Design an enzyme around this catalytic site. Structure first.
Site, PDB file in Angstrom:
ATOM      1  N   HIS C  78       0.869  -1.206  -0.081  1.00  0.00           N
ATOM      2  CA  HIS C  78      -0.054   0.026  -0.146  1.00  0.00           C
ATOM      3  C   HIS C  78       0.835   1.188   0.155  1.00  0.00           C
ATOM      4  O   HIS C  78       0.855   2.242  -0.760  1.00  0.00           O
ATOM      5  CB  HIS C  78      -1.015   0.049   1.292  1.00  0.00           C
ATOM      6  CG  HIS C  78      -1.745  -1.096   1.254  1.00  0.00           C
ATOM      7  ND1 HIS C  78      -2.584  -1.581   2.240  1.00  0.00           N
ATOM      8  CD2 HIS C  78      -2.251  -2.118   0.271  1.00  0.00           C
ATOM      9  CE1 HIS C  78      -3.426  -2.502   1.949  1.00  0.00           C
ATOM     10  NE2 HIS C  78      -3.257  -2.821   0.723  1.00  0.00           N
ATOM     11  N   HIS C 237      -9.176  -1.603  -5.464  1.00  0.00           N
ATOM     12  CA  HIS C 237      -8.144  -1.820  -4.084  1.00  0.00           C
ATOM     13  C   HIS C 237      -7.218  -2.829  -4.853  1.00  0.00           C
ATOM     14  O   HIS C 237      -5.876  -2.901  -4.473  1.00  0.00           O
ATOM     15  CB  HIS C 237      -8.606  -2.383  -3.000  1.00  0.00           C
ATOM     16  CG  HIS C 237      -7.468  -2.675  -1.995  1.00  0.00           C
ATOM     17  ND1 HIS C 237      -7.166  -1.603  -1.278  1.00  0.00           N
ATOM     18  CD2 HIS C 237      -6.804  -3.653  -1.705  1.00  0.00           C
ATOM     19  CE1 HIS C 237      -6.127  -2.127  -0.644  1.00  0.00           C
ATOM     20  NE2 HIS C 237      -5.763  -3.204  -0.776  1.00  0.00           N
ATOM     21  N   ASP C 241      -3.159  -2.702  -5.100  1.00  0.00           N
ATOM     22  CA  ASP C 241      -2.043  -3.677  -4.992  1.00  0.00           C
ATOM     23  C   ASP C 241      -1.345  -3.963  -5.987  1.00  0.00           C
ATOM     24  O   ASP C 241      -0.256  -4.128  -5.830  1.00  0.00           O
ATOM     25  CB  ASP C 241      -2.837  -4.838  -4.467  1.00  0.00           C
ATOM     26  CG  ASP C 241      -3.535  -4.984  -3.036  1.00  0.00           C
ATOM     27  OD1 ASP C 241      -3.034  -4.001  -2.378  1.00  0.00           O
ATOM     28  OD2 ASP C 241      -4.491  -5.698  -2.854  1.00  0.00           O
ATOM     29  N   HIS C 264      -0.670 -11.176  -4.479  1.00  0.00           N
ATOM     30  CA  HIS C 264       0.715 -10.773  -4.526  1.00  0.00           C
ATOM     31  C   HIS C 264       1.396 -11.787  -5.163  1.00  0.00           C
ATOM     32  O   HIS C 264       2.691 -11.362  -5.587  1.00  0.00           O
ATOM     33  CB  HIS C 264       0.921 -10.598  -2.958  1.00  0.00           C
ATOM     34  CG  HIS C 264       0.043  -9.429  -2.300  1.00  0.00           C
ATOM     35  ND1 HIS C 264      -0.068  -8.267  -2.984  1.00  0.00           N
ATOM     36  CD2 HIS C 264      -0.971  -9.569  -1.255  1.00  0.00           C
ATOM     37  CE1 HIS C 264      -1.085  -7.596  -2.259  1.00  0.00           C
ATOM     38  NE2 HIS C 264      -1.600  -8.398  -1.239  1.00  0.00           N
TER      39      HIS C 264
HETATM   40  O1  LIG Z   1      -5.136  -5.769   0.796  1.00  0.00           O
HETATM   41  C1  LIG Z   1      -4.437  -6.790   1.496  1.00  0.00           C
HETATM   42  N1  LIG Z   1      -3.174  -7.041   0.585  1.00  0.00           N
HETATM   43  O2  LIG Z   1      -2.493  -6.006  -0.127  1.00  0.00           O
HETATM   44  C2  LIG Z   1      -5.019  -7.236   2.223  1.00  0.00           C
HETATM   45  C3  LIG Z   1      -5.826  -8.577   1.682  1.00  0.00           C
HETATM   46  C4  LIG Z   1      -6.561  -9.272   2.799  1.00  0.00           C
HETATM   47  C5  LIG Z   1      -6.479 -10.616   3.141  1.00  0.00           C
HETATM   48  C6  LIG Z   1      -7.129 -11.224   4.159  1.00  0.00           C
HETATM   49  C7  LIG Z   1      -8.311 -10.568   4.648  1.00  0.00           C
HETATM   50  C8  LIG Z   1      -8.904 -11.042   5.644  1.00  0.00           C
HETATM   51  C9  LIG Z   1     -10.152 -10.615   6.479  1.00  0.00           C
HETATM   52  C10 LIG Z   1     -10.357  -9.155   6.095  1.00  0.00           C
HETATM   53  C11 LIG Z   1      -9.506  -8.446   5.018  1.00  0.00           C
HETATM   54  C12 LIG Z   1      -8.376  -9.215   4.320  1.00  0.00           C
HETATM   55  C13 LIG Z   1      -7.829  -8.501   3.449  1.00  0.00           C
HETATM   56  N2  LIG Z   1      -4.065  -8.105   3.104  1.00  0.00           N
HETATM   57  S1  LIG Z   1      -3.778  -7.460   4.661  1.00  0.00           S
HETATM   58  O3  LIG Z   1      -3.263  -6.150   4.274  1.00  0.00           O
HETATM   59  O4  LIG Z   1      -2.258  -8.209   4.975  1.00  0.00           O
HETATM   60  C14 LIG Z   1      -4.807  -7.518   5.551  1.00  0.00           C
HETATM   61  C15 LIG Z   1      -4.901  -8.907   6.079  1.00  0.00           C
HETATM   62  C16 LIG Z   1      -6.149  -9.271   6.963  1.00  0.00           C
HETATM   63  C17 LIG Z   1      -6.699  -8.167   7.370  1.00  0.00           C
HETATM   64  C18 LIG Z   1      -7.747  -8.459   8.396  1.00  0.00           C
HETATM   65  C19 LIG Z   1      -8.605  -7.128   9.033  1.00  0.00           C
HETATM   66  C20 LIG Z   1      -8.398  -6.060   8.376  1.00  0.00           C
HETATM   67  C21 LIG Z   1      -7.424  -5.821   7.381  1.00  0.00           C
HETATM   68  C22 LIG Z   1      -6.746  -6.821   7.041  1.00  0.00           C
HETATM   69  C23 LIG Z   1      -5.561  -6.791   6.067  1.00  0.00           C
HETATM   70 ZN   LIG Z   2      -3.990  -4.328  -0.499  1.00  0.00          ZN
END
Ligand SMILES: O=C(NO)[C@@H](Cc1ccc2ccccc2c1)NS(=O)(=O)c1ccc2ccccc2c1
Ligand SMILES: [Zn+2]
Ligand SMILES: O=C(NO)[C@@H](Cc1ccc2ccccc2c1)NS(=O)(=O)c1ccc2ccccc2c1
Ligand SMILES: O=C(NO)[C@@H](Cc1ccc2ccccc2c1)NS(=O)(=O)c1ccc2ccccc2c1
Ligand SMILES: [Zn+2]
Ligand SMILES: [Zn+2]
Ligand SMILES: [Zn+2]
Ligand SMILES: [Zn+2]
Ligand SMILES: [Zn+2]
Ligand SMILES: [Zn+2]
Lengths: 299, 294, 288
Positions: C78, C237, C241, C264
């Site tokens: 990000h 989003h 990414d 990723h």
């Molecule tokens: O945007 C991302 N990576 O660039 C997120 C993707 C992701 C993966 C798994 C999730 C599970 C539940 C909610 C949201 C999620 C998003 N990866 S992350 O930035 O590492 C990320 C992982 C888990 C989260 C849980 C809750 C809020 C934000 C999150 C971000």
């Molecule tokens: Zn992301």
């Protein structure tokens, strides 16, 4: 006696190769009794022939491919479906390239070519393969099954949950005859997502493939300007593929096929599994005034 | 103390085997203290007993299958759910075949048979397995979790995107502090697609399987003439399954189960993983019933 | 000449770590020409630096993770998307822990912090990597592709058939000659299911994750009280990414990216495949 059939006359046609995007020259010829369907590469010297039989199948990725050494012919199943549909036992299919032209993406064109060439009954008993017991294969959630049936019946179901498919007919069954094949199955076109076409067209593949020879969808809608030929076109095409792939057995089938998300690979695996189980099938003929439980078009 | 419980009398019943399509003969018998639930194949000579324990689970393709050598008993989970639900510690289950009869596809018939056999308290403390720390397992998109909880709670979520499921209740939680297994869980029938019944039958599997012992769906609608028993019947049957599969621990659970698309395989994996992690659980008893969870 | 760019001033921030739930300290610093973006584990002694380059990517489970030996920095994409979007060639990102703080789940905070730092043009030609031939990778049903294009364009498509996603934009293209990264992409928040959050929390993971730093959905609806920042926030989003992950090439891209359910891992695999296919790209500068 129920007799073998070939073509009455030679007929020629042309179309684009799906892979090459180049013009391919096709010739259908009569052939002797017990020849089967044989593809020949007449662009090669010497000419290479490949009998349309399960044991000659190579790749089954996008279409069914026949191979002999390094020589191949792909995109065979739609033409073979038409040969099966009209009860053509013996024929040569000459090609100027490594693929059968895709035409309109259905078996309709090939039905019309066979019809134009005309049918010729031959003085030899038609052999049928009768399914005697159940045979099945599975690959993940995909299944393909043979069961005994006095006739020929092909059933298929797909399962797409994308908006474009939700509520559309995704199951169908055909009790097979020449007449139910030509009007209810033969003109069903192949289908795929535009994003899949985009992906192939990037990296210079499927160069001849477009809305002109497939139903093209996105996530939400059918993109072809003129829509579908049949409301059940998607699942009817899978039945068409199955009929074509199963004709690599080399003779008309007496039995029932049921597919769930089956493709060329699983269809071919089912054939191999059947052939190897000698207790699951028998070759039969209908002589001395006996008749077969399948109806074919009169010559 | 809270005492162990068995049946007061023997009771017999019959039902079609889901697999064989043949009538199966079932007897529930009282059993001594610390026996647990033991399945007995009385068609074999000698008779073969298989304790209903996590270690004895062989395959888990369609149901939970107990195995000893070449002998098996599958479709044990619906009956085990009722044993668990009604607090039966010790009992023998005699069968004439390699499966518990499927009955109506729910635990309802077994609730009647157990209650009609009667409950008998025994002179020994009932043992419970208390979850002390979180344990989880996954397989693809499927998850199964144990979490510490002062009571017994089962949560489940399924995720089908087929039209027939879009919008239906696919998540539920039952806290047995306030809620009855019999009323809220026991009558939920198993379910599946007609296309799968067709296929299984063609393989001479599920020869007894029909709308008479399952909710049967196609891609778009429920096929049973009178529809569902409860609006949440799909997800409640998964809870029923979980309760039965978890009872292969051999004792009532003090803790919370959470499943997402979990099946019999992953359920058993959770149990095996829990057992191996000795600091994630303990056995407890209650010398004063007032100190137990409500 | 088009010149390289760094930050004018040092700028600091703090935020909760997504994984740890602890306060993480961050510092953005100018860097010399040809440094690229460098992450620094400034909590360690000696300090450990990890260049943000495709070859240093380790795990790609949930975020992009940079590694050097047993030292890691994750959740880099990000911030990297913001660096790419504002044309920052050279900078150090100092951290007090093994993760960039998640902030509001988008690139918006990082855009604002970079903007606050100011821009400093440097006396060296900016290098671009131009895509001259098509390159593609695939993983299951997922696809990522580079195609030659005179500019920078990112196209993305997701395919979710759950009720919560049906009837939303699931494909978008951004041609950055017409579209502004800052106004059309940078504020798109990450997203996921509440059931996934609940599962991670039970494993003592994602301890800092909530509706405060993600769009949280269930099977049928968005749970955030405030709805979406854009109608197409989900696909935007993914584009965000992609931009972050692609900046691990080390220079701005002249070409087009097309993803279908690319994550990723596939993004990185595309970079490594491109790098290895030397005939499919060239480094270019602009004298005017
Ligand atoms: O945007 C991302 N990576 O660039 C997120 C993707 C992701 C993966 C798994 C999730 C599970 C539940 C909610 C949201 C999620 C998003 N990866 S992350 O930035 O590492 C990320 C992982 C888990 C989260 C849980 C809750 C809020 C934000 C999150 C971000
Ligand atoms: Zn992301
Ligand atoms: O019907 C077939 N085989 O019997 C098609 C199946 C198929 C596979 C992949 C596709 C990708 C995109 C669109 C349509 C597709 C259909 N196989 S095929 O006849 O070899 C074939 C492959 C690719 C095509 C792209 C575009 C038009 C027609 C095509 C046919
Ligand atoms: O509830 C179960 N186990 O605890 C069912 C799950 C199941 C699996 C596959 C099915 C296919 C079609 C219909 C219903 C299905 C349910 N397993 S089972 O008790 O072994 C069972 C399997 C197959 C059946 C077919 C038809 C009726 C009842 C069945 C029960
Ligand atoms: Zn079989
Ligand atoms: Zn979809
Ligand atoms: Zn086809
Ligand atoms: Zn479906
Ligand atoms: Zn069940
Ligand atoms: Zn869903």
């Amino acid at each position: 006696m129920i007799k073998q059939r070939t073509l009455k006359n030679i007929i020629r046609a042309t179309g684009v190769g799906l892979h090459s995007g180049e013009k391919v020259y096709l010739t259908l010829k009569p052939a002797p009794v017990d020849t089967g369907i044989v593809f020949s590469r007449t662009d090669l010297d010497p000419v290479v022939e490949i009998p349309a039989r399960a044991e000659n199948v190579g790749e089954t990725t996008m279409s069914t491919t026949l191979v002999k050494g390094d020589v191949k012919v792909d995109t065979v199943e739609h033409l073979l479906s038409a040969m099966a549909g009209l009860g053509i036992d013996n024929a040569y299919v000459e090609l100027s390239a490594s693929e059968v032209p895709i035409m309109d993406g259905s078996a309709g064109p090939f039905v019309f070519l066979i019809q134009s060439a005309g049918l010729q009954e031959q003085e030899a008993a038609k052999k049928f393969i009768r399914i005697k017991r159940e045979v099945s294969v599975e690959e993940g959630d995909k299944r393909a099954v043979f069961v005994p049936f006095d006739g020929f019946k092909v059933s298929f179901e797909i399962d797409f949950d994308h908006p474009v498919f939700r509520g559309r007919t995704q199951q169908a069954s055909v009790d097979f005859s020449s007449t139910s094949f030509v009007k209810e199955v033969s003109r069903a076109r192949t289908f795929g997502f535009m994003r899949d076409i985009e992906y192939l067209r990037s990296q210079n593949l499927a160069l001849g493939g477009s809305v002109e020879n497939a139903i093209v969808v996105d996530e939400n809608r059918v993109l072809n300007e003129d829509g579908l030929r049949y409301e059940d076109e998607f699942v009817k095409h899978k039945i068409l593929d199955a009929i074509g792939d199963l004709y690599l057995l080399g003779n008309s089938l007496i039995g029932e096929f049921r597919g769930f998300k089956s493709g060329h690979a699983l269809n071919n695996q089912l054939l191999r599994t059947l052939i190897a189980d000698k207790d699951a099938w028998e070759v039969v003929t209908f002589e001395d005034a006996r008749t077969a439980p399948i109806s074919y078009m009169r010559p």
